[PDB]
């Protein structure tokens, strides 16, 4: 596994998240379900608890944006970069942005919002990319059955190394 340089970590364990907007490819429910299940993989392997707020200042804000979107790291249209996240911190820290131009799905067709969100959430929690091709934290996307999905061992090792 690989930790974000500088080892940034949340000095807190109950963190809140907020879904600022949705993608019209999927229903709101399915979007909300992908995010919830994505936060839970990490949750069952660490002491972190995740609470959703409908509005207000959450620790981790989630949003789908296009090209330029205020943070100096414009997305690039279809394919290529799918999403990105900010390491732990106050402010934009912890935030996860998804490319609004992608095809978001909840099947095997590219892309599956759950596998990508669970990936972004590791970064928001302080993990960098892993060189283990089987880890969720691998640089490039790959579909894995999601129905009864759980965190690969290399990723468990990773949040464990950070949070215990």
Q: Is 120 labeled as catalytic in the residue annotation? A: yes
What distance in Å separates the CA atoms of residue 147 and residue 112, rounded to the nearest whole number?
12
Closest of 16, 92, 9, 83 to residue 46, by C-alpha = 9
Asked if residue 57 binds Zn ion (CB under 5 A), the reply is no
CB of 138 to Zn ion, least distance (A): 8
| Torsional sign, CA 101, 105, 108, 109 | negative
Establish if 97 lies at the interface with Zn ion (CB under 5 A).
yes
- 84, 50 Cβ separation under 8 angstroms: no
**Which region, judged by CB under 5 A, interacts with Zn ion, from 3-11, 34-42, 89-97, 150-158?**
89-97
43-82 binders of Ca ion (CB under 5 A): 76, 80-81
Q: Tell me the β-bridge partners of 50.
A: 15
76 binds Zn ion (CB under 5 A): no
Residues 86-105 close enough to bind Ca ion by CB under 5 A? 93-95, 99
| Comparison of 57 and 71: residue with beta carbon closer to Zn ion | 71
Structure tokens at 60: 């981790």
The active-site residue, picked from 32, 57, 101, 120, is 120
- Least CB distance to Zn ion at residue 42 (A): 14
Stretch that binds Zn ion, among 20-28, 51-59, 91-99, 150-158 (CB under 5 A): 91-99
The angle formed by the CA atoms of residues 113, 118 and 123, to the nearest 5 degrees, is 125
The entry of Ca ion, Zn ion, none that residue 71 binds, CB within 5 to 8 Å by partner kind: Zn ion
107-119 exposure pattern, b = at least 16 Cβ within 10 A, e = fewer: eeeebbbbbbbbb
According to the annotation, is 122 in a ligand binding site?
no
Q: Which helix (H) or strand (E) holds 43?
A: helix 28-43
Q: Which residues bind Zn ion (CB under 5 A)?
A: 71, 97
Which amino acids are annotated catalytic? 120
């Amino acid at each position: 596994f690989m930790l974000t340089p500088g080892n940034p970590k949340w000095e807190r364990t109950n963190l809140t998240y907020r879904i600022r907007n949705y993608t019209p490819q999927l229903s709101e429910a399915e979007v909300e379900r992908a995010i919830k299940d994505a936060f839970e993989l990490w949750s069952v392997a660490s002491p972190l608890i995740f609470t959703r707020i409908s509005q207000g200042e959450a620790d981790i804000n989630i949003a789908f944006y296009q090209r330029d979107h205020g943070d100096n790291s414009p997305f690039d249209g279809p394919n290529g970069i799918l999403a990105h996240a900010f390491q732990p911190g106050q402010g934009i820290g912890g935030d996860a942005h998804f490319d609004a131009e992608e095809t978001w799905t909840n099947t095997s067709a590219n892309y599956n919002l759950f596998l990508v969100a669970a990936h972004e959430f590791g970064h928001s929690l302080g993990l960098a990319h892993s060189s283990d091709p089987g880890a969720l934290m691998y640089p490039n996307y790959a579909f894995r059955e999601t129905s009864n999905y759980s965190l690969p061992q290399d990723d468990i090792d990773g949040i464990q190394a950070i949070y215990g």
